[PDB]
Design a binder for these strands. Structure first.
Ligand SMILES: [K+]
Ligand SMILES: [K+]
Ligand SMILES: [K+]
Ligand SMILES: [K+]
Ligand SMILES: [K+]
Ligand SMILES: [K+]
Ligand SMILES: [K+]
Ligand SMILES: [K+]
Ligand SMILES: [K+]
Ligand SMILES: [K+]
Ligand SMILES: [K+]
Ligand SMILES: [K+]
Ligand SMILES: [Mg+2]
Ligand SMILES: [Mg+2]
Ligand SMILES: [Mg+2]
Ligand SMILES: [Mg+2]
Ligand SMILES: [Mg+2]
Ligand SMILES: [Mg+2]
Ligand SMILES: [Mg+2]
Ligand SMILES: [Mg+2]
Ligand SMILES: [Mg+2]
Ligand SMILES: [Mg+2]
Ligand SMILES: [Zn+2]
Lengths: 60, 82, 205, 96, 153, 127, 114
RNA sequence: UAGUUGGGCACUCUAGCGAGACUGCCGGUGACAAACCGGAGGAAGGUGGGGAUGACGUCAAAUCAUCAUGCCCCUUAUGACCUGGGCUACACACGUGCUACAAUGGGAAGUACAACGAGUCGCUAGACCGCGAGGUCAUGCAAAUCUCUUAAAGCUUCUCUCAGUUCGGAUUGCAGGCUGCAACUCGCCUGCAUGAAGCCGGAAUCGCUAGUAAUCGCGGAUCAGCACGCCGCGGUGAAUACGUUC
């Protein structure tokens, strides 16, 4: 049901609060960063690849 | 709770049905999915079959019942005990 | 135990962002644009030995440096092939796409290229041991200070999956100064997916 | 003239700042700076695993170094000179 | 720990009585790092001590420490299938520790409404050689004597 | 003539300035007692004079900011020691052996992930 | 005493008035402000005329049996209409939306270990 | 009136380049070493403190529900659209936390010191209304420039006086605020009303060796609305380490 959910999420929502954010890379609904529009999994995956500008391992 | 400025709330379709039935000698059951509707003094005198998640339960309206959401008068889930 | 991604570990120490551009309000749109561009380029030039894609952004322009071991193949005759790619990318993105090509000297020392080659062979039903060994020899001849490779899955279609790996030289993943290239590729077989990992250590930085 | 530069890497930021200062200084207008500003930092934490395993985490820091330049007595040539000096995509530049 | 004895952190003497012992007492009474309340209560208690007895509160407190500080403690030791206590001389650091610990514990148990009042009452009794703190010290010495047959361990 | 100095402790940083006087100490335009109402902290501040035998010799004007009162008290002490060294190098021996020169580097240990504090861990149940 | 409840005598007047059912700390302060009586003075020292004025204020208020009957009428009203709230009252369960898998002891009663 | 204005960057601060800590030097032990003990200097001495970093492997551990995927099953249905409902149930059992059981305290008043981070239709100054939640007008700020944001413990006065209380803040009635089409199922917050259990906790059990524990606030990610959770920050700040028998 992932594809149908993805398509419906893309479509405009009937009411404002209905609109919800998915990971545009995989469609995962939960833990979707607004800054990157990616889930945590996809974000961490791409960040390791180095294809998310600016991001890097945090340490202090 | 609900802001006073916004005024009372009720679904438009439900409101239209009650208004059309206002001049009715014998009120007929109003089948509604709308739990959100607030009850109104005009609503008094009617029986409303409110959806409970699996069927429309009829509930009779009266002056005491006014001022509350319809869905409250129709319990969703059933629990008998252990 | 698990290990940090070899590239992601050194990103910012000696490795740099492949998406080389800066933005604040269009970060999301530009990142999604980059992802779609990468996907389309990978699908289009799968045959070509395309390893690295670097994106730079200046106003509405987008510069794309594509590294390949077959620059002739990617360009085509008289710039024909790259021009067609540019037009398709313009349609996809909606903005000017400047394209640059780079010749990958020593493809044997590239993680993704070596891994993809092993994946092709596994799809072709070569002995995985032979594939990894000859890949290692090519890398060592190319001059890697070290190489390491691993293939995991239902080897030979076996019911119980396992992992077989080889290495030569030195591949100190923990040493941060060390320039250790890494890449992961999946070789899809009749029995499912087989995962190939390659670590290549060149002269440290 | 006031110029704000932002970059994820201080090295290219400094290189571009030197370029701006040299071109402005070459054009003759006086230059004030480069003035470092507090590098902005954002942090994001994600569960290292893909399922359960809440305790094990990983944290990612995005750093934005910013430099400020103030060019005094701007000559007419300086404005075009600074509009011609093109910095890499890795540095974001703001003028006034 | 396993490696060996560690270095001990020192404490600067008191601002108004200029002694490390008073500061140790302040830290002892301290709760949740609210050293301001701790030191205020200690000073109020010493004022009450001077009031109820024109003597030096510092001298009274030293007398209370000498009265409560144990000499022979009992350390539990397991011998085969039987475990029993063994008498042991108390190193001076633990002596002061036990004195301050007992005083504060028993002072907190007292029935007076305010802590400084309770502490003052307990300190005076200890200086007088009476009260729960001296009672605890007597019990420890009494237990040491009872199990004294195990001293050879 | 004013002898300057700087002290740091936790997140508190103090710019100290000695002017010869009666030992009156003003911090951020207010007296030590007004600002630091804790006698313990005030005595900590005054330690350098006691070790260097310069009691009451110099009044101090300190501009300090950041951190809490106790941290700022430590920072004030460090700045005063540095200012005394400026006044006289020969104070170095006494100041060092008292450790006033040494920079107290103990900072706030960061919170670890998964751990409710720098070292506190969730309550553990075996089963 | 005031409305038929012997408020504590030694305590301060504010707290003594609170001991009245239907009167909280805020209402106690308000009535003392109206009457002009200091909040610190104890009731045992309060003069009789002050007591009469305070009684007049309270009489204006609605408290004690009146308040209990009013609130119980509301609860009775819920139950008689048979609302969800009425059934919550009827079965002694949290009415304001609390979870019941755990806690809910206040409404439910003591634990029945079964 | 204001570091305001003029003026200067000296100091702090900011962020680049650097220097520094390397058992580097002295003494002692040592098998001529390794190394260990101490000293000097020095801000830091022996890894200075903390983070990242997780070897070959182990548990057919977890994940076919992030994703991908062999094979098997459904294909007018296990696929798809809409409304409503549930995941929030509730005799009980367990884990993890929040608040408490009070005077090292509660209440009233005064007064002082942080850091980390967030803000465009968002942070929002100031002012008007409102007891409050907030409403109105309206300002600056895409931000070391304005705002969120005068932090809480603290310290200094007044009150309470050992009371299941002026502790407690559960439960419940009424009346409001917001967000949203919508607050009943089923949000948060506020005022009035009420004041539950709870008097320091059986067997057993958890964390921690220092700016740690303990204790106090602050920011943020998700986010129309919603945290006692999580990430991070700063304030105050201990006791103890005898020792390796269990
Ligand atoms: K989401
Ligand atoms: K519930
Ligand atoms: K529970
Ligand atoms: K510097
Ligand atoms: K799947
Ligand atoms: K599958
Ligand atoms: K359990
Ligand atoms: K909790
Ligand atoms: K008080
Ligand atoms: K609701
Ligand atoms: K307990
Ligand atoms: K929120
Ligand atoms: Mg939502
Ligand atoms: Mg009352
Ligand atoms: Mg609820
Ligand atoms: Mg290591
Ligand atoms: Mg299994
Ligand atoms: Mg599937
Ligand atoms: Mg659930
Ligand atoms: Mg009690
Ligand atoms: Mg340890
Ligand atoms: Mg802290
Ligand atoms: Zn994703």
């Amino acid at each position: 049901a992932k594809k149908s959910m993805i398509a419906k999420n893309k479509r405009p929502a009937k009411h404002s609060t209905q609109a919800y954010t998915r990971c545009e890379r995989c469609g995962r609904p939960h833990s979707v960063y607004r800054k990157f529009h990616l889930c945590r999994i996809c974000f961490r995956e791409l960040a390791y690849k180095g294809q998310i500008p600016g991001v890097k391992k945090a340490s202090w | 709770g609900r802001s006073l400025k916004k005024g009372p709330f009720v679904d438009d379709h439900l409101m239209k049905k009650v208004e059309a039935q206002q001049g009715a000698e014998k009120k007929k059951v109003i089948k509604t999915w709308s739990r959100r509707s607030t009850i109104f003094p005009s609503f008094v005198g009617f029986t409303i079959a409110v959806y409970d998640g699996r069927k429309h339960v009829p509930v009779y309206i009266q002056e005491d019942m006014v001022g509350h959401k319809l869905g409250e008068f129709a319990p969703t889930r059933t629990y008998r005990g252990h | 135990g698990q290990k940090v991604h070899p590239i992601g570990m050194r990103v910012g120490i000696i490795r740099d962002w492949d998406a080389k551009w800066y933005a604040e309000k269009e970060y999301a749109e530009f990142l999604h644009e980059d992802l779609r561009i990468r996907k389309f380029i990978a699908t289009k030039l799968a045959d070509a030995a395309v390893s690295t894609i670097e994106i730079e952004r200046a106003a509405n322009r987008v510069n794309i440096s594509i590294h390949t071991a077959k620059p002739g193949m990617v360009i085509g005759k008289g710039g024909s092939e790259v021009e067609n790619l540019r037009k398709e990318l313009n349609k996809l993105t909606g903005k000017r796409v400047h394209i640059n090509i780079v010749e990958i000297k020593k493809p044997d020392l590239d993680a993704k290229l070596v891994g993809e080659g092993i994946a092709r062979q596994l799809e072709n039903r070569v002995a995985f041991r032979r594939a990894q060994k000859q890949a290692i020899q090519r890398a060592m001849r190319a001059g890697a200070k070290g190489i390491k490779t691993q293939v995991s899955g239902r080897l030979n279609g076996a019911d119980i999956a396992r992992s077989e790996g080889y290495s030569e030289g030195t591949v100190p993943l923990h040493t941060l100064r060390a320039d250790i290239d890494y890449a992961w590729e999946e070789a899809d077989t009749t029995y499912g997916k087989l995962g190939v990992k390659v670590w290549i250590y060149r002269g440290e930085i | 003239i006031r110029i704000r530069l932002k970059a994820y890497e201080h090295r290219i930021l400094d290189q571009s700042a030197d370029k701006i200062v040299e071109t402005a200084k070459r054009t003759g207008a006086d230059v004030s700076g480069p003035i470092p500003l507090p590098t902005e930092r954002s942090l994001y934490t994600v569960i290292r695993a893909t399922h359960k395993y809440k305790d094990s985490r990983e944290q990612f820091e995005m750093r934005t170094h910013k430099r400020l330049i103030d060019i005094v007595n701007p000559t007419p040539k300086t404005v075009d000179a600074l509009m011609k000096l093109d910095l890499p995509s890795g540095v974001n530049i703001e003028i006034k | 720990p396993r490696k060996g004895p560690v270095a001990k952190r020192d404490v600067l003497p008191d601002p108004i009585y200029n002694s490390k012992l008073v500061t140790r007492l302040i830290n002892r009474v301290m709760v949740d790092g609210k050293r301001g309340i701790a030191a205020n209560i200690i000073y109020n208690s010493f004022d009450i001590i001077k009031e109820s007895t024109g003597n030096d509160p510092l001298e009274v407190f030293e007398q209370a420490m000498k009265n409560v500080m144990p000499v022979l403690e009992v350390k539990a030791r397991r011998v085969g299938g039987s475990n029993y206590q063994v008498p042991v001389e108390v190193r001076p650091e633990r002596r002061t520790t036990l004195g301050l610990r007992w005083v504060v514990n028993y002072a907190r148990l007292r029935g007076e409404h305010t802590m400084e009042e309770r502490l003052a009452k307990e300190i005076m009794d200890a200086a007088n050689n009476t009260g729960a703190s001296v009672k605890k010290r007597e019990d420890t010495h009494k237990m040491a004597d009872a199990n004294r047959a195990f001293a050879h361990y | 003539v004013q002898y300057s100095g700087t002290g740091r402790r936790k997140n508190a940083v103090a710019r100290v300035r000695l002017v010869p006087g009666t030992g009156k100490i003003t911090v951020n335009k207010k007296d030590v007692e007004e600002y630091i109402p804790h006698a313990d902290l005030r005595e900590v501040i005054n330690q350098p004079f006691g070790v260097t035998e310069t009691k009451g010799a110099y009044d101090v004007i300190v501009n300090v900011n950041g951190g809490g009162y106790a941290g700022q008290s430590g920072a004030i002490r460090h700045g005063i020691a540095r200012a005394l060294l400026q006044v006289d190098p020969d104070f170095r021996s006494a100041l060092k052996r008292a450790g006033l020169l040494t920079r107290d580097a103990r900072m706030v240990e960061r919170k670890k992930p998964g751990l409710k504090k720098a070292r506190k861990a969730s309550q553990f149940s075996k089963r | 005493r005031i409305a038929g409840v012997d408020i504590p005598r030694d305590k301060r007047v504010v707290v003594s008035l609170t001991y009245i059912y239907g009167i909280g700390n805020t209402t106690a302060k308000k009535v003392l402000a109206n009457v002009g009586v200091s909040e610190d003075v104890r009731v045992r020292d309060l003069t009789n005329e002050q007591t009469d004025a305070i009684r007049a204020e309270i009489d204006k208020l609605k408290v004690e049996g009146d308040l209990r009957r009013e609130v119980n009428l509301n609860i009775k009203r819920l139950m008689e209409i048979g609302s969800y709230r009425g059934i919550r009252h009827r079965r002694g369960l949290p009415t304001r939306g609390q979870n019941t898998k755990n806690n809910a002891r206040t409404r439910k009663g003591p634990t029945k270990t079964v």
